[PDB]
Design a protein around this ligand. Structure first.
Ligand SMILES: *[C@@H]1O[C@H](CO)[C@@H](O[C@@H]2O[C@H](CO)[C@@H](O)[C@H](O)[C@H]2NC(C)=O)[C@H](O)[C@H]1NC(C)=O
Ligand SMILES: CN1CCC[C@H]1c1cccnc1
Lengths: 400, 400, 400, 400, 400
């Protein structure tokens, strides 16, 4: 249109995009800064970066970009690309992208009275600390720090407006608790000019249904399965394979969880210590199995049963468990031969009678250690799982 | 040509690529927006990102870019590169590309009446929520949101033209149901103007043949083979070995299928339900095998058969399953030794006959659990697989 | 050079890089398009993306860029950079790259009479369909579709010339067969004017010396070793172990072959069919082994062999496979004691005879199933591998 | 303001951004260089690349950009963008980024007396030598070499200022020791002029809690479990299974650590030595188990035990380990028969005694090898771990 | 300063960066090309690309950039950024980078007499054929081809200087042998115009210590462990398990080697041949073990040993292997009963004698195959390992 042609010709006359558009040089320029969260793309525990989709929102007042609507009827807003008009050089301090500023440079909407609006979108790769002490029951606080790079207090001051989450799209993995900001200043040593900035802390809680169902219940189920070795009869000589096989499966599980995990040395992760507890449990199970197997295959002609073992395992450990202890000249020569055979059979029976005691002792030890291990595994898993804060309500909100 | 030289020189005179080319400044500018799908390149469920090849279609009527054909014979159209004429600032809202705009800027073809055509190509990475509840018998809807970034409804009013799929190249994995769009007018609280926008919802369906042949069926054969532990005779120890090795094969399968899919906590996936059910079936099979082995290797005098088991397993279950039960002074000394040997043999005979009942009971319970688990696996697999709403359609299309 | 400087100054007077350089505006401008293949960098079966290294060859005639050599002695050719002279806008229609035009903008060499040459190199990524129906004996045809984006057939007469392969560098995996090209005219829904394009089809054949050694031969070897169970005597305890470990190795092998290959549902790959057949073979091997184990440990005093089963196994197959079957008052008291002992021994001998007959039946069944499984796996492997077309030619070229 | 606009107009006048801003052309310009470490992001061992977040600091004195604040009251500082004033060309020599210069070009802040201050941020990837001889108890020294590219020592007098670590954010895995720097002068084959450069060395210590808990301790535990084969009675065939399965798990661990470790041939890693030692220990355990099993299943009436082995095993070693060694005509015909039976039984008893002595010898060998292997593995592990320098410092700082 | 500004203003008058800076247009311009190796970043065997840190080095003479120092006393050199002066267009012919020119454009230093220096750094990625026939004892030649893209003999004749390896930082895996170069001229069909270019060949030798300690030694050790199946007595039921688990471990080792190595089909790698040989050895080890097991569990009444086997496995090899072969009417009824019992025991004795003879034959076969396999494995290993060229050089330079 004719009027907007005239306006665009007139406005850029003697305009320098290198100057602050303030009527008075001494007075600072007021700039309002705010966010608009749209989505959380990914939270990388291993690399400790946070990727989000965010619309910035900056606004100020321009002294020179003013006109009277009466002289230019119909036109009431104008737009300018980058470089042609002055903009605040506000950029993220916590950036982790290769280019230090990931932000699409869009148009600047201008008032008929000098008020500019700037809403550039972009995908921001922050670098925030990822606490992993209570994984997978986590609450994370990642900070985004914005502010002018080469402008001070007398240059321009920054004011905070509350973050907008009206357009938030919920994420499958993380639950957004909130996003509160704060405006703070920082004085230097030379000069008493406040240097303001705005920081936003994004707080998220991990939803634990997936990690629970895929990590914890399988591991606890097969750890409970690992106690079946104490139920097998020792005569079926395939007890060791069970223990070693479940140990191998647990090792595979551990190395995968190490794969997902980062490599910080700040604290012992809950899942890692739980896996270590299961490691020790299965190892002690295998050791006890070897002990019982040694007891079962005892040589009858070897050493005698010690009195301590006899009085402990066969008496007290049986009372505790209420387990029952289930217990003519040639005529002389032929007589001697038959007597020899009978005596040999008697000796064989007496020798076999000894092995029964050892086998019963093996069964008793097996039952006792079964009970002890079954109690211990439950105690350990319950204590470790419930030791984490943010567990009861986490499970109540996820699994229910 | 001299005529096109003169025309190109004349058109750019006084032209301003900043002003919106309308004869009347008060009235808006109508812009027609459409789409042209070429192919779907990727659907990443783990990152929730859709990659497509798309040709944008825009069209508006410029005002100043007009000329008389008679004055410039031969010339019918002109072409302008980026930055030399006014273009709509149309952007994709939900984008996952690090650079927010992912369109290749090409020339604009302008007719002699002042009609501009803009057909920029590009590869678009938009983020859409990919439901995984009914995986792999899945149907997904992903939305693309387009619209001007900084032009209002009093200035630029979008219009819809139906999407073009004439050039579509079919995908191997995804079947395209269709891509219907819709035009809507959002209203601002300040002002009575509309804010037109156009959204395109791409609907696709996964083809269930690769997954069917590589994940579903192999698990069925492995689970079925896990029941071979029951037909096996307990005399040759292989039962626990069989059970555990099937278990680990299932674990590695579950690890694969877990690393394929994302960590969302919105619902339990169908494949997860199937694998968990197989987990439980194999574990219970191993437990039953342990019980059977305990029954088989029973000490002949370590106890007595309780009346409940003696009646049940030996008569009732044999009835149900139709299995038959498996069935001078120097001479008196010789007398008592020979009778002692005979008595020893008789005692051994009766003790050996005792264990036959225990072995038969083990066989009976083994057959019973075989039948029960054979029914259970079939029922569970059939129910879980047929629970999917479009299972019949998928099996009729992909397979038949 | 003064002459070079003066000519460069003169050639750019009133030159518009926006106009098509023709003497008469009505007739189109002829452009010859070719292509110089240099290297096939990579073929991505999983992503259906082909990466090649090519040099474009465009040539046309510029009417304004002419000069008389007699007045410019030394200079015979000139070079112009990007954006200073008119260039055709030719780009790939199939680019699977984040940027839709991956070419390095080099100079344009100009004749002394107005002929322009343009040879921009670059690495081109394109999306072409990949066939896995005959993996790894497949022949792939991929397409490269070039054309002007914004010039119709009335302004750009695109022509074609044969592709150049004189500098081709052979690849270590794919053997180049040829690269023809054909011109075509297409109508687009945008506009009522044909748009010519030039399509080059690259035909290449995969060499099968690496896959034949690392995916086929090991599978055959361990499938054959899976038949070693039928030789192993049942008196040992390592038959089920053999079978199930073979299954584990086979599953790992198939899983890796699955991860390398694309997830298409258009056909069942040859390697997939082979792996499924081998899975079935080993599974039935395990089932037969279970049956033989149950036969060999058959408990006597239970059910006698059926007449049909006996007359089959002990006679027909036994003769067929050339197998031979394994074949004072105290005196009265002493008398009936020794009578009891002798009768006990006689009954024991009868029981052992029945057991020996059962074990012979098991051996015969094992031998027969050995023969059947061996012949069946041989014929299935040969048939599956020889079903593919151009298999013998590939075998000859690669191995011999 | 008016003063700001006038000053910006005045400064730009007759300014060439190509000339070095010095009052005297023959005098070198002084530039102060400094660093500000913000965060160590990644230490890639395989690729030997260190990624850090760094702010560069540069400062010099421009001769032309000076003014009197009396004539320009409000304005005290001005800002200039890239490409409008002279800037140094300081760039990293060791950059490993695909684009050689990875820095964000910000404004340049200027005094009223011409003092320029330039603080460009950026994320720098540099190639530094990584030493893994003492992994995971290593201390690394990575250098960053900065310096002007095309400015010699007679024009740009580079100076170094101490690095700033006040804004350092501690990293979970790496511990910062110090960042000293020195300014050295070098000669290059290009030119006969010295080119000064500034090198900063980053010294980092690796926190070892993660690796100590995830790699060393589980390896220790399962290596110890591998010694249980010397407590299993030989009558249960489950010793080779134990040894070989632990060997398999060890091989898996070796594969994983080799995955983490880079391919280098400078010196053997400590963890590589540890895993090799564990390999040999477990292999020797398996060999000893094979020897013991061969001893146990001796066939009597065959090889008589040699006198040397007899005495060594059953006199000295057995006592040393406190092991106790275990241990009418018809009447004539019947006499002959009973004599034959008794003699056969006596021969069986003698064979049993020989078997018992062989089994006792096997047990003695087993116990002796158990003790030897235990002491050997303890000594080897403790020596290998303790050989690393500052291992005591590492454990004291991390664990305690 | 003053003279700097004056000279900079004077040097750009009427200066066209598009023209070749020569005094005579007909005569060509001499350009000297060179290189400066800094580091070999990576050698990718799979994608077959080479990454290096390189500073190019070009030098030529400019006719127009000349001045007399006495007129401008302070300035001796001037610097021009990209786009201000004429630069030769020299780029990598065989680059394998997504952008065809990975080169950082720095300043150009010009002397008082017109000499120009241009040393742009960069991280180049070139695709060079990588031979893998001799892995890991490998020597690779990679060629870098540089040349002009638009100029020829009458326009630009590239001379040569030897590549500079001063300041080259040794890599931990690849040892540099040399970087020879060679200039050459190529003529076109039309005209006798040379087209000189410079090519550099980088020759590097892989250091084999890491691969020897991670791939060769462990596989030899496990292969030797596989031979232990020939010392385990047949009574233990753990002979098949040993061989099978060795096969599994070696399969996963082959998997790793498959992942590291390229998928070429031009030769059979040495490591591939060695792994195939070891596979074959273990396979016949398992086959022989099965034969021995079926030989040892031979029923006494199932047949008789053939004469050939009886004479070759019991008299010839036994001596060769130095093994010794191990070795009133009621009274009549009582007599007949005891005669029956004695005859029964006699038949048992003959049976176990035949069984013992069969077991001796099995042991002899076992020892024979042990010796044969022990010789064969070492023969094949030595042959394959020493078959490679420069293997003595590799071991001498790495392990000493
Ligand atoms: C400016 O730079 C070039 C650098 O080469 C100088 O050329 C050298 O001049 C000396 C004088 O004898 C010769 O020995 C060298 O061989 C020349 N080098 C080359 C490549 O030709 C040139 O002299 C310098 N000019 C001034 C005024 O310093
Ligand atoms: C052939 N071109 C490429 C696709 C459409 C067509 C076109 C037509 C007009 C303006 N731009 C593109």
């Amino acid at each position: 249109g004719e009027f907007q042609r005239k306006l665009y010709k007139e406005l850029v006359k003697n305009y320098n995009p290198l100057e602050r558009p303030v009527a008075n040089d001494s007075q600072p320029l007021t700039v309002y800064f705010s966010l608009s969260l749209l989505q959380i793309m990914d939270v990388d525990e291993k690399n400790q970066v946070l990727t989000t989709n965010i619309w910035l929102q900056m606004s100020w007042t321009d002294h020179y970009l003013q006109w009277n609507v009466s002289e230019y009827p119909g036109v009431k807003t104008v737009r300018f690309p980058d470089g042609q008009i002055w903009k605040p050089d506000i950029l993220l301090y916590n950036s982790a992208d290769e280019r230090f500023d990931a932000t699409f440079h869009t148009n600047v909407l201008v008032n008929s009275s000098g008020h500019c609006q700037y809403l550039p979108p972009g995908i921001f790769k922050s670098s925030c600390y990822i606490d992993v002490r209570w994984f997978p029951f986590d609450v994370q606080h990642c900070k985004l720090k914005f502010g002018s790079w080469s402008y001070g207090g007398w240059s321009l001051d920054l004011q905070m407006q509350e973050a907008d989450i009206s357009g938030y799209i919920p994420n499958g993995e993380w639950d957004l608790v909130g996003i509160p900001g704060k405006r703070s200043e920082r004085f230097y040593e030379c000069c008493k000019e406040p240097y303001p900035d705005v920081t936003f802390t994004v707080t998220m809680r991990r939803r634990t249904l997936y990690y629970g169902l895929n990590l914890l219940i399988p591991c606890v189920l097969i750890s409970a399965l690992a106690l079946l070795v104490f139920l097998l009869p020792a005569d079926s000589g395939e007890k060791i394979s069970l223990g070693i096989t479940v140990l191998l499966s647990l090792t595979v599980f551990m190395l995968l969880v190490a794969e997902i995990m980062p490599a910080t040395s700040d604290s012992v992760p809950l899942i890692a210590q739980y896996f270590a507890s299961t490691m020790i449990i299965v190892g002690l199970s295998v050791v006890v199995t070897v002990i019982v197997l040694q007891y079962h295959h005892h040589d009858p002609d070897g050493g005698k049963m010690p009195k301590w073992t006899r009085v402990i395992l066969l008496n007290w450990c049986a009372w505790f468990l209420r387990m029952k202890r289930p217990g003519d000249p040639d005529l002389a020569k032929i007589l001697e031969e038959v007597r020899y055979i009978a005596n040999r059979f008697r000796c064989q029976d007496e020798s076999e009678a000894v092995c029964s005691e050892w086998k019963f002792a093996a069964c008793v030890v097996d039952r006792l250690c079964l009970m002890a291990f079954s109690v211990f595994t439950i105690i350990c898993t319950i204590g470790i799982l419930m030791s984490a804060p943010n567990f009861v309500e986490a499970v109540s909100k996820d699994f229910a």
